[PDB]
């Protein structure tokens, strides 16, 4: 399967940027090295959030999985309540705990 999106974890205290590919289906974000998008940092929940992608040409849906430190949309600033679906927009900035990320749609 070719990736259809990217999650960019920006550079920070943890070192240079890390880029994670996003595929059709369930892409789990969490600390567990099993996760599709493994962010191995103590403040990230073991199962933190899920990005669900139904097709290359459909917006991903992000949901927080009841994480301890939350998932936020950076701009406009919002807290995502557990279990509520949010459609991701290309270039949208997301916080998983204190880790800023950016979602990019790929082509095609």
């Amino acid at each position: 399967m070719e990736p259809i999106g990217q999650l960019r974890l920006f550079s920070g205290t943890h070192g240079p940027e890390r880029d994670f590919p996003l595929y059709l289906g369930k892409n789990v974000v969490g600390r567990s090295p099993d996760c599709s998008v493994a962010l191995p940092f103590p403040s990230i929940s073991k199962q933190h959030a899920v990005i669900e992608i139904s097709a290359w040409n459909k917006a991903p849906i992000l949901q927080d999985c009841g994480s301890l430190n939350g998932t936020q949309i950076v701009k406009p600033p919002r807290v995502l309540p557990p279990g509520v679906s949010h459609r991701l927009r290309d270039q949208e900035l997301i916080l998983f705990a204190d880790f800023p990320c950016q979602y990019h749609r790929l082509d095609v």
Binding site: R31, P42, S43, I44, K46, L68, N69, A97
Partner: peptide, 8 residues
């Protein structure tokens, strides 16, 4: 290990 809470 459980998740570390963020505080100050």
């Amino acid at each position: 290990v459980s998740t570390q809470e963020l505080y100050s």
